[model samples]
Target: AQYEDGKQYTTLEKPVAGAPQVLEFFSFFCPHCYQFEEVLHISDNVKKKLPEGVKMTKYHVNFMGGDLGKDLTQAWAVAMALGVEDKVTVPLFEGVQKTQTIRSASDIRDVFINAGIKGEEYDAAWNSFVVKSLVAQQEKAAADVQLRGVPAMFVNGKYQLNPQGMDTSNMDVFVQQYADTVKYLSEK
Candidate 1:
């Protein structure tokens, strides 16, 4: 049941369709989460390895951030809804961990603003019932799985990736192992 792959992943009880949906759990406040992307390039590599129709989705989890975690969660939801996550992602991580300038909830607005999103446009999405619902769903899913960490992933909602056994010292090897596991599970 648990530790199904003994290393790469653990099988889920409520297996979700055994289909090819890959969901990633990440938090902007995490350094490794940033490294996982900016350095290892796990998501892009895994995407390349996935089947033609299989796609990956990302969830910005709430537990790994500050008292303003929910604030950024809403920010991320708005970014996604507005199709600007690609633009704000690196800046959010850099703003939080490197520059340490985004110390307030409203500070998140500027990140979007800098991306050319008008205040009213951001507000419309940020204040909408739609963003509210997705943020709640994201928060609920994290706790539902008792997720207490960063840069985690699930395949088909039926496999929780376990990377402790993977050698992170070599970025290329780690990314390769992860993509292989992800690709294998996507077909499983």
Candidate 2:
């Protein structure tokens, strides 16, 4: 209720307009996203009371590379379709990007495989037109937002979250207000 529109959040030029959704724009190779995940943990905690029916979705921004970045994004899409983003998120960031333990598309596949996801299931999602559509959607959304960097979220595919102006006096304040901003915009 106390968050301002332009400072704490901003509306899109053309809204996606539908059942409101929380769309996060990020990347597996982004250090900022990883740091936020490590310290702030809002992305994980904000789900505590996210507006019901307004599910949070992630878009892997592909500004970082040619085949590798695109492959990472496709890998992410496949993970989401199979409901194993939880398993894919950490290792991609920690193992691949951070530790350099992962390389190539097959290495990315091994992350999913290591998560206990079978090869057939991975291939099914990877080869499906539906997942292809999602990967396209994610890339398009990232461009539509005119994204300059990682770690951005939009509600209803329009309102973008502005962390720069949020109440970050302490960890809890930012976490609650971050989630609150999403909830606030969920109804907006």
Best by TM-score: 1
Worst 10 residues of 2 by lDDT: 14-23
Task: State residue 132's C-alpha deviation in candidate 2, in Å.
Answer: 1.7
Where's the lowest-lDDT run of ten residues in candidate 1? Answer: 11-20
Instruction: Provide the TM-score for each candidate, comma-separated.
Output: 0.90, 0.89
lDDT of 1 by residue, 1-188 (tens): 32247687887766655333888888888888989887788889999999998888888877766677778889989987898878998888888888988888888898889889999999999889999988987776676556768888888777888888666877788899888889888888
- Which lDDT tens digits does candidate 2 get at residues 115-186? 899999999999999899989888777767777788888887778899888877987888778888888887
The alpha-carbon RMSD values of the candidates against the true structure, listed in the order shown, are: 2.8, 2.0
| Alpha carbon deviation, residue 53, candidate 1 (Å) | 1.2
Which stretches of candidate 1 lie above 4 Å from their native place? 1-4, 16-20
Evaluate model 1: give its lDDT.
Answer: 0.82
